[PDB]
């Protein structure tokens, strides 16, 4: 019924590069929704709140907090397996860099995962990801912004305009984050 | 016990981007050798050809080696994947597999033997894995791009080793 | 005397790449204002309206139509000359791209100064004692955006929503 | 009679990125030769010897030392004017980054330089260049290598394999260069 694009990350904090990549994959892979799935380290409520603010304006974007759950999964196989059990009627896709598995030799563990859920490999306009694997590709325009660059900019008091949503910036300032 | 970097790929043909990445991983990760491992499709460029071009591409580098374990996974009743057969043959060595991290900012914990990520210098990557990276200078060259060049008669200089180009020519490969 | 960054362009349409580059030059080179200067040769009117919308939210950005007033019917000034003519005491900084090649030639015999823009980490050598602004890469252009509008592809996160809104209701870009 | 591509740089030292770019332009702009023109110091002996070594393998690559001459030109207009005078029957082209002039407003001093000689703008595959100016364009695969990175690698004792020609590395190490 629904084509869901699983989009993982730290989103510490979420930024324009995240929104851009998600929208491009959404359109290019003909998906219905993109689920922003924040990972967890064994703070979080701040990441959850900045994410909600970042995605608000895009009806096609959702927040998936399965990894935040008590005794929740963290390994992709487990996380994807649970989501498949919760949404058996939907078609799930997993987003990765198109080059993540380019240099790997034949590996059953990888194949098991690739057969569990349809992988979408993100790459820059043009460019070829050789190595044969079941993969849907999505060309996304390069936008060199990262959560780490953003954090240091806040710390060093450098501008963040056009790199992060205004609402995210406002939330960061009000909560004394990345000081 | 040696530190070995495993480099999978089709290598049709092998190019300077392959050589560069392998060498950077080799020194930045403090490894002893890099093993180039040509893959093969189930009959669905010929392998002996890709293997020959590889030998030529890595000749000049002593730390580079050709390994054909993916070409010998088939047993009379059981078939190993490349990773398991390698561990079988070299149980005492430290095998490092290479993971790309040049397109996305985050790397998922998709795997439950070590890994080395390769990204462009300056490119920030976050991941739950305590992973060591190798900052490889960007080199927008691929086998696909190279094949198109041979076919369309465009230059290949500085993109592929001269000996590999010579092989392609002496064997009429790539239209 | 202000420190003014001159930002030439076709801006049809203006996009987030333009705003980001301007903001970075503005701050990194410690300037007071950045002047977006549409070249003349989409009709000027629309490009001018889209530009106002694009820069509105940023106080340090200004629209300057001097390149559109270079004709005084007997003599035509080039933009640089009319600017010095109008603001002789201000410090005018022109922006030079240096993100494709390693070297920047001494092509100009140099009130007028230059600022180079390149990706962070990209090393540039030049005989010029030039200040560079490290602008994060953003692979977006006007041409690319026009094509997306024409083929009904997304433009979200690439251009300001107000610019997109203006394009749609004015039936611009087919 | 000859279509020449003027390729300026510090070439301190020359590396594979230079050779690649030059070959691509040559082919893409249908040129006959590419002239590597070392810029005047705002020593040179070593840069010149490495350049000779770097281009030896390509018959289409030539060395142009006009900026090295006593009382020689250093500004593009001056340099090009002298070269056009020395080679009146050939068609010269000047190589620059395609974005060099992308952000400049109408300027006659630039127009004058562009009419003096045909400019070629190098850029990455795809990605457009707005630029209300002549310019012939040449798409060149991105090869993230520069003379700065190389020098730092020699200093830090990092590998330079596949980044610079063997003969160049040989020259650097024989003359103990860049280990500052």
Swiss-Prot record, chain B:
Single annotated GO MF: nicotinate-nucleotide adenylyltransferase activity
Gene Ontology biological-process annotations: NAD biosynthetic process
Substrates-to-products reaction catalysed: nicotinate beta-D-ribonucleotide + ATP + H(+) = deamido-NAD(+) + diphosphate
Alphabetic keyword roster: ATP-binding, NAD, Nucleotide-binding, Nucleotidyltransferase, Pyridine nucleotide biosynthesis, Transferase
EC number(s) on file: 2.7.7.18
Disulfide bonds: none
Pathway this chain belongs to: Cofactor biosynthesis; NAD(+) biosynthesis; deamido-NAD(+) from nicotinate D-ribonucleotide: step 1/1
Family as reported in the entry's similarity comment: Belongs to the NadD family.
Subunit composition and interactions: Homodimer.
NCBIfam families: cyt_tran_rel (TIGR00125), nicotinate (nicotinamide) nucleotide adenylyltransferase (TIGR00482), PRK00071.1-3 (NF000840), PRK00071.1-4 (NF000841)
Role: Catalyzes the reversible adenylation of nicotinate mononucleotide (NaMN) to nicotinic acid adenine dinucleotide (NaAD).
Family matches, as PANTHER family: NICOTINATE-NUCLEOTIDE ADENYLYLTRANSFERASE-RELATED (PTHR39321), PHOSPHOPANTETHEINE ADENYLYLTRANSFERASE (PTHR39321:SF3)
Protein name: Nicotinate-nucleotide adenylyltransferase
Organism name: Bacillus subtilis (strain 168)
